[PDB]
Design a binder for these strands. Structure first.
Ligand SMILES: [Mn+2]
Ligand SMILES: [Mn+2]
Ligand SMILES: [Mn+2]
Length: 222
DNA sequence: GAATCAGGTGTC
């Protein structure tokens, strides 16, 4: 119903949500979702079972229009997690085929390239956002799994890059990766100016990424 | 799914 109020008022209304905010690795995934056909079971992903999201997505990506945006781990470091988040969100709206006259954005304090509004707990106040919530999360998880493929020594399919005990084990044992968020404190902690220069000399990170994390590295213990 | 332990950073 919340959706319908805004639908009647503003016209085409997209729901937006993102996943991967609190992660130590990988990009942040945002999803924009416009939908008219009803989908029973709609609810914020984190209440659902991983396998149910799966069946709800197949359904969602059949009755709805969906845009997907991502922001690079490099962009998180250079821009911060928040602007990287808005950036990802705006890339989703961009990828959406339907151009909404209005957006419902989960959270607070986010203003996108499309006039809209910000709902706290929006992912459980709105069906569109709850749906955008399931798209982001599943798509993200998928990105992380194939990262276990690219870095076999890493349980990215289990911990999704988050600060779990075993993720921190895999980092101390195996080292820090370019896809880790180098500005994120637990990583900054383990990283050395020596590995940082290597990343750069290998052409793995950017000159701008290097300068930041380097300046961040020397700023430690302050 | 809910409880409760862990672990991240942006806004203001
Ligand atoms: Mn929520
Ligand atoms: Mn959510
Ligand atoms: Mn900070």
């Amino acid at each position: 119903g919340i959706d319908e109020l805004y639908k009647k008022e503003f016209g085409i209304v997209a729901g937006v949500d993102e996943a991967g905010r609190g992660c130590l690795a990988g990009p942040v995934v945002a999803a924009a979702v416009v939908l008219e056909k009803e989908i029973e079971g709609i609810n914020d992903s984190k209440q659902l079972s991983p396998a149910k999201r799966e069946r709800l997505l197949d359904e969602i990506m059949e009755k709805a229009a969906v845009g997907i945006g991502i922001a690079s781990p490099e962009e998180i470091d250079l821009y911060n997690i928040f602007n990287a988040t808005k950036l990802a969100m705006n890339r989703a709206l961009e990828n959406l085929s339907v151009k909404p006259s209005f957006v419902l954005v989960n959270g607070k304090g986010i203003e996108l390239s499309v006039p809209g509004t910000c709902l706290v707990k929006g992912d459980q106040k709105s069906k569109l956002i709850g749906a955008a919530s399931i798209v982001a999360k599943v798509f993200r998880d998928r990105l992380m799994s194939e990262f276990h493929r690219m870095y076999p020594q890493f349980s990215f399919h289990k911990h999704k890059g988050y600060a779990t005990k075993e993720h921190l084990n895999e980092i101390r044992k195996n080292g820090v990766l370019p896809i880790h968020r180098l500005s994120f404190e637990p990583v900054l902690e383990l990283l050395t100016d020596d590995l940082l220069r290597e990343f750069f000399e290998k052409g793995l990170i950017s000159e701008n990424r290097f300068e930041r994390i380097l300046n961040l590295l020397g700023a430690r213990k302050s």
